[PDB]
Amino acid sequence: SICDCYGIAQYREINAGLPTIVTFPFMFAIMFGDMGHGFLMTLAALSLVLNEKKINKMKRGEIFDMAFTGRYIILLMGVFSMYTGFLYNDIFSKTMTIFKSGWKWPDHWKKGESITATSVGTYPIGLDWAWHGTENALLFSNSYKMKLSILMGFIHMTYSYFFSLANHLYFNSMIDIIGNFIPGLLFMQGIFGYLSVCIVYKWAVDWVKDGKPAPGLLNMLINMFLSPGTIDDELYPHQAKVQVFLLLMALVCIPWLLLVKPLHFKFT
Amino acid sequence: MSSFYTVVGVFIVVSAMSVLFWIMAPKNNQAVWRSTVILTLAMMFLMWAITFLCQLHPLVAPRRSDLRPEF
Amino acid sequence: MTELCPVYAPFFGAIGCASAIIFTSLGAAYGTAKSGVGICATCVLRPDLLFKNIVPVIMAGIIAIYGLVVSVLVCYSLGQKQALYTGFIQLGAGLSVGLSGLAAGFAIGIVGDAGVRGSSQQPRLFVGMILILIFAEVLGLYGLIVALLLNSRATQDVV
Amino acid sequence: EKEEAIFRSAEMALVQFYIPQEISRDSAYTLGQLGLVQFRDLNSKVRAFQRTFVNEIRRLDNVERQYRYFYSLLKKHDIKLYEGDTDKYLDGSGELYVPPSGSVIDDYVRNASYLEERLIQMEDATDQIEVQKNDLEQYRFILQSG
Amino acid sequence: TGKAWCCTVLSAFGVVILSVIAHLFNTNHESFVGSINDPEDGPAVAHTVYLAALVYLVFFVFCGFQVYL
Amino acid sequence: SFSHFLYYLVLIVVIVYGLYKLFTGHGSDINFGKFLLRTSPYMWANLGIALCVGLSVVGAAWGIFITGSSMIGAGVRAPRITTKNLISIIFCEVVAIYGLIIAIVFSSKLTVATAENMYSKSNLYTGYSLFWAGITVGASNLICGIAVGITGATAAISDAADSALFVKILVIEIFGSILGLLGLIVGLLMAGKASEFQ
Numbered sequence: 001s002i003c004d005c006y007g008i009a010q011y012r013e014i015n016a017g018l019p020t021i022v023t024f025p026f027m028f029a030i031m032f033g034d035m036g037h038g039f040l041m042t043l044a045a046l047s048l049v050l051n052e053k054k055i056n057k058m059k060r061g062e063i064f065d066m067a068f069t070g071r072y073i074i075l076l077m078g079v080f081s082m083y084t085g086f087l088y089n090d091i092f093s094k095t096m097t098i099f100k101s102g103w104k105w106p107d108h109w110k111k112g113e114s115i116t117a118t119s120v121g122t123y124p125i126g127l128d129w130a131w132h133g134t135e136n137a138l139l140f141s142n143s144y145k146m147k148l149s150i151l152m153g154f155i156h157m158t159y160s161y162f163f164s165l166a167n168h169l170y171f172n173s174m175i176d177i178i179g180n181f182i183p184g185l186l187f188m189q190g191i192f193g194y195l196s197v198c199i200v201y202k203w204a205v206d207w208v209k210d211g212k213p214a215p216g217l218l219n220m221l222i223n224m225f226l227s228p229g230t231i232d233d234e235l236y237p238h239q240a241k242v243q244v245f246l247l248l249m250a251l252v253c254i255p256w257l258l259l260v261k262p263l264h265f266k267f268t
Numbered sequence: 269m270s271s272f273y274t275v276v277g278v279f280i281v282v283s284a285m286s287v288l289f290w291i292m293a294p295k296n297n298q299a300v301w302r303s304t305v306i307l308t309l310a311m312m313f314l315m316w317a318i319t320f321l322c323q324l325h326p327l328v329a330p331r332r333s334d335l336r337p338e339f
Numbered sequence: 340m341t342e343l344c345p346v347y348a349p350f351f352g353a354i355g356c357a358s359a360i361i362f363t364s365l366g367a368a369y370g371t372a373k374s375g376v377g378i379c380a381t382c383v384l385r386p387d388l389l390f391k392n393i394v395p396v397i398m399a400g401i402i403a404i405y406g407l408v409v410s411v412l413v414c415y416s417l418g419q420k421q422a423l424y425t426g427f428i429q430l431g432a433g434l435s436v437g438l439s440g441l442a443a444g445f446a447i448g449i450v451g452d453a454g455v456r457g458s459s460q461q462p463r464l465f466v467g468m469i470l471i472l473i474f475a476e477v478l479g480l481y482g483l484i485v486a487l488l489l490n491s492r493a494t495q496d497v498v
Numbered sequence: 499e500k501e502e503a504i505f506r507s508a509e510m511a512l513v514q515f516y517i518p519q520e521i522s523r524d525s526a527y528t529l530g531q532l533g534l535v536q537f538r539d540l541n542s543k544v545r546a547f548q549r550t551f552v553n554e555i556r557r558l559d560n561v562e563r564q565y566r567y568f569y570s571l572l573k574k575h576d577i578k579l580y581e582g583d584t585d586k587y588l589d590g591s592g593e594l595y596v597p598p599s600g601s602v603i604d605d606y607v608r609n610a611s612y613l614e615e616r617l618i619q620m621e622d623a624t625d626q627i628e629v630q631k632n633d634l635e636q637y638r639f640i641l642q643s644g
Numbered sequence: 645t646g647k648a649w650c651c652t653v654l655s656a657f658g659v660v661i662l663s664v665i666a667h668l669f670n671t672n673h674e675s676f677v678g679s680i681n682d683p684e685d686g687p688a689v690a691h692t693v694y695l696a697a698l699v700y701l702v703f704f705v706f707c708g709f710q711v712y713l
Numbered sequence: 714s715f716s717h718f719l720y721y722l723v724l725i726v727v728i729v730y731g732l733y734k735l736f737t738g739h740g741s742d743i744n745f746g747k748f749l750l751r752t753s754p755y756m757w758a759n760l761g762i763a764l765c766v767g768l769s770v771v772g773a774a775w776g777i778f779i780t781g782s783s784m785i786g787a788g789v790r791a792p793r794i795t796t797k798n799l800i801s802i803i804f805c806e807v808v809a810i811y812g813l814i815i816a817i818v819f820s821s822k823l824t825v826a827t828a829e830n831m832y833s834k835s836n837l838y839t840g841y842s843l844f845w846a847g848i849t850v851g852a853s854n855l856i857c858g859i860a861v862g863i864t865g866a867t868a869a870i871s872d873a874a875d876s877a878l879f880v881k882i883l884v885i886e887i888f889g890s891i892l893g894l895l896g897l898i899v900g901l902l903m904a905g906k907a908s909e910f911q
C-alpha cells in the first residue's frame with residue numbers, strides 16, 4: 001500500500017514491494033539507531049499484533065488505523081534499530097562494555113593532563129567504548145557515518161538498476177539493453193564505484209607504518225575531472241593512467257546513450 | 269588475528285547460507301521468505317564490515333583530559 | 340591582553356548564543372500563529388479534525404528545541420580568556436542554526452495553514468501535507484549540523 | 499498449480515459473455531458474489547441518457563432519495579438506528595446465494611412512496627403547532643415582568 | 645482507564661532503569677563515575693536511587709489493582 | 714518616506730565626511746587597505762561558511778511554499794497530483810544539500826595559526842576566498858530556489874488541468890536546477906588552491 005500510492009505498476013513488471021519489506025525499515029534504523037528508543041517501538045507494535053483479533057472487530061479512528069494497518073512495519077523498524085544501536089553502541093545515550101577494548105591509556109597520568117590512547121587490537125562488533133566521553137569523538141564518527149551513507153546508497157541504487165535488465169529480458173527488448181542499460185551502468189560505476197572502491201581500500205592500508213601520507217578523497221575526485229594526469233598524494237600505482245581512462249569512458253557513454261536508439265528507429 | 273581476511277571469511281560463510289536457504293525455503297510464500305532473509309543477512313553484513321574496517325588502521329586516536337588518576 | 344586573546348573576543352560567543360534562540364523563536368512563532376489560525380477556522384464546522392491538524396504546530400516547536408541545543412553547547416565553551424579563533428566559531432554556529440530555523444519556520448506556517456484548510460475539504464490531502472512539511476523541518480536540521488561540526492574545532496589545539 | 503503474484507503481477511485473461519435477456523438479471527448477482535471480474539465499457543460513445551436501462555435505474559434512484567429523507571428525520575430526533583446481520587448475505591468468501599424477486603423490488607417502490615406521503619404530512623401537522631406554541635410563550639414571558 | 649495505565653507503564657520501567665543505574669554506581673562502573681565531574685562516592689548515590697525506585701513500585705502495584713478491577 | 718529618507722541621509726554623511734578629510738589633507742586616513750590587512754582572516758572565513766548554508770536554506774524554504782501552497786489548492790479537485798508533483802519539492806531541497814557539502818569541505822581548512830604568521834600572504838588569501846566562495850554558493854542557490862518554486866507552482870496547476878502537460882514543463886524545471894550546480898563548481902575552483910591556516 002506504500003508503493004501503490006506513488007504509482008500502479010505496469011503489467012508483468014518487477015514489483016517494488018518485495019525489496020521494500022527490508023530496505024524501508026533498515027534505512028530507518030541507520031538514522032534512528034538506538035537500543036532504547038527501539039525497544040520501545042518494538043513493544044508499542046507488539047501490543048497491536050497480539051490483540052489484532054480484538055482490535056479488528058472493534059471500531060477505530062483515523063490515526064489508530066494507520067498504526068494498525070502498519071503494525072508489522074513498526075515491528076521491523078524496532079528489531080533493526082536494536083541491531084544498529086548495538087553497532088553504534090548507544091543505549092539511551094550511554095554505552096555498553098561487553099568486550100575488551102582495542103585502545104589503552106597510559107600506565108600513569110595526573111589530573112587535567114590531556115592523555116591519548118595507544119592501540120592494542122581491533123574491537124570485534126561495533127564502535128569501541130573508549131570513544132565515549134572523548135574530546136575528539138565526533139571527528140571519528142562523522143567520518144565513519146558519511147562513508148557508511150555513501151556506500152549504502154550506491155548498493156541500494158545499483159541493485160535497483162539491475163531490475164531494468166530483468167524486465168528487458170522478460171519483454172524481449174534487446175535494443176534498450178544496448179541503448180539504455182549498458183551505457184548508464186558504465187557512467188556511474190566509473191565515477192561513483194571508483195569512489196566506493198577507494199574508501200574500502202584506504203581503510204585497508206597502514207599508512208603510518210608504511211610512512212606514506214594518507215590522501216584526501218574529495219580532492220582526488222575533483223582533480224580527476226579538472227586536471228587529469230595530476231596527483232598530489234598517491235593511493236595506488238598507475239592511479240593517473242586509470243583515472244583518465246575512466247573519464248574517457250564516461251564521455252563516450254553520453255552520446256552513445258543519446259544517439260543509438262533513435263537511429264534504430266529511423267532505420268527500423 | 270584481525271585483518272581484511274577476517275571480512276572475507278565472514279562473506280564466505282554468509283554467501284553460503286543464502287544459497288542453502290534458497291534451496292530449503294518452503295513452497296508456501298516462497299518468494300517472501302527467499303527475498304526477505306537473503307536481503308536481510310546482506311545488509312547486516314555490510315554494516316558490520318564497514319564498522320570493522322574503520323578500526324583496523326585508524327589515523328586518529330582517542331584523547332581526553334577528564335579521567336580520574338585511579339582509573 | 341595578547342595578540343591571540345583579546346578582551347572583546349567573548350562578544351562573538353555571547354551574541355552567537357543569544358541569536359540562536361532569538362532567530363529560532365521568531366520562526367516558530369510565525370509558524371505557530373499562521374498555522375494556528377487555520378485550525379481555529381476549520382474546526383468551527385469540522386471539530387473532529389482538531390487533534391489531527393496540530394501537526395504543523397508540532398513541527399515548529401521542534402525548530403525551537405534545535406536553537407536551544409546550540410545555545411547550551413556554545414555557552415560552556417566561553418571564558419574571559421579565550422582565543423579569537425574560538426569566538427568566531429561560536430558566532431557561525433548561532434548564525435547558522437538561527438538563520439536556517441527562521442526560514443524553515445516561516446514555511447511551516449504558510450504550508451501548514453493551507454493544508455489544514457484543504458484537508459477539511461479533501462481528506463486524501465492530509466498525507467500530502469505531511470510530506471511537504473518534513474522538507475521544511477529538515478532545513479532547520481541542516482543548519483544544526485553545521486553548528487556541530489564547527490563547535491568540535493572550538494578549543495582544539497588552542498594556546 | 500495456483501500462482502503467487504508478488505514478484506510480478508498476476509497473469510490475466512479476457513473473456514466474452516453470451517447472456518440471454520431472460521437470465522441477465524440473475525447472472526449478474528452471481529458474478530458480484532465472486533468479486534473476480536472487471537468489466538470493460540463497450541458502450542463508451544453512447545450518451546448517458548441514450549443508454550437502455552436508464553429507465554429501470556430511476557425507479558431505484560428515487561427510492562434511495564426517499565430513504566435519505568427518512569434517515570434525516572431520525573437523526574433530527576434522538577432515535578438510534580437498528581443494525582442487522584452484515585453477514586447474512588455473505589462472509590466475503592465467494593459463496594453462492596439466491597437473489598430477490600422482481601415483485602419484491604416493485605413493493606419497495608409503492609411502500610416507500612406511500613410512506614413519504616404520510617410522514618411529509620405528519621411533520622407539517624407537528625411543526626405548525628410548535629409555531630403557535632413559541633408565539634404564546636413569548637407572549638407569556640413578557641407578561642411576567644412587572 | 646488511561647489515567648491509570650500511564651503511571652503503570654511509566655512506573656513499570658522506573659523500577660527497571662533506576663535499579664540498573666543504582667547497580668552500576670554501587671559497583672563503581674567507569675562510565676558513571678570515571679570523569680571528575682561525576683560524583684565522587686558511588687554507593688551513596690545508589691542508596692538514594694534504590695529508594696526512588698521503590699516509590700515508583702508503590703505507584704505500580706496501586707494502579708495495577710485500580711485497572712485490574 | 715522614512716526608510717528611504719535614511720538611505721539618503723547616510724549618503725549625505727559619507728560625502729560630507731569624505732570632503733572634510735580631503736580638503737584638509739587627510740584623505741589617506743580613510744584607508745581600506747589596512748582594514749583588510751589588520752582584520753582577522755577567521756572573521757571572513759566563518760561568515761562565508763554561515764552565509765553559504767544560511768542563504769541556501771532561505772532559497773529552499775522559499776520555493777517549498779510557492780510549490781507547496783499551490784499543490785494543496787490544486788489538490789482539492791485533483792488529489793492525484795500530490796505525489797506526481799512531488800519532484801518539485803525535491804529540486805528545491807537539494808540546493809540546501811549543496812550548501813552543506815561546501816561547509817564540509819571548508820571546515821577542514823579551519824586550523825589554528827601561530828601569532829607571528831597570522832597576517833601572512835597565504836592566510837589572508839584563504840580568508841578572502843572562503844568569504845566570496847560562500848557568498849557565491851549561497852546567493853546563487855537562493856536564486857535557483859525561488860525560481861524553481863515559481864516554475865513548479867505552474868506545473869501543479871497544469872497537471873490538475875491535464876496529466877499530459879506535466880512532463881512538458883519539467884524541462885523548464887530541470888534547466889533552472891543547473892544554476893545551483895554551476896555555483897558549487899565555481900566555489901570549489903576558488904578554494905581549490907587555498908591552503909589550511911598555518
Ligand SMILES: CCCCCCCC/C=C/CCCCCCCC(=O)OC[C@H](COP(=O)(O)OCCN)OC(=O)CCCCCCC/C=C/CCCCCCCC
Nearest residue numbers: 345346347348350353354355356357358359360361362437
Ligand atoms: C544613546 C544611548 C541609548 C541607546 C542605547 C542603544 C544601543 C546603542 C549602541 C550601543 C553600542 C555602541 C556603543 C559602544 C561602543 C564602544 C564600546 C567600547 O569602547 O568598546 C571598545 C572595544 C575595543 O577596545 P580596544 O580595541 O582596546 O580599542 C580602544 C577602545 N576604542 O570594542 C568592543 O568592546 C566592541 C563592542 C561593541 C558592541 C556593539 C554592539 C552591541 C550589541 C548590539 C546588538 C544590536 C543588534 C541586535 C542583535 C540581535 C541578535 C542577537
Ligand SMILES: CCCCCCCC/C=C\CCCCCCCC(=O)OC[C@H](COP(=O)(O)OCCN)OC(=O)CCCCCCC/C=C/CCCCCCCC
Nearest residue numbers: 001002005063066067069070073074390391394397466469
Ligand atoms: C509529529 C509528531 C506526532 C507524531 C504522531 C505519530 C503517531 C503514530 C502514527 C502512525 C505511524 C505508523 C503507521 C504508518 C505506516 C503505515 C501506513 C499505511 O499503511 O498507510 C496506508 C495508506 C494507504 O491506505 P489507507 O489510506 O490507510 O486506506 C486503506 C487502509 N486499508 O498509505 C498511504 O496513504 C501512503 C503513504 C504512507 C505513509 C503515510 C505516513 C503518514 C504518517 C502521519 C502521522 C500523523 C500523526 C498525527 C498525530 C495526531 C495525534 C493526535
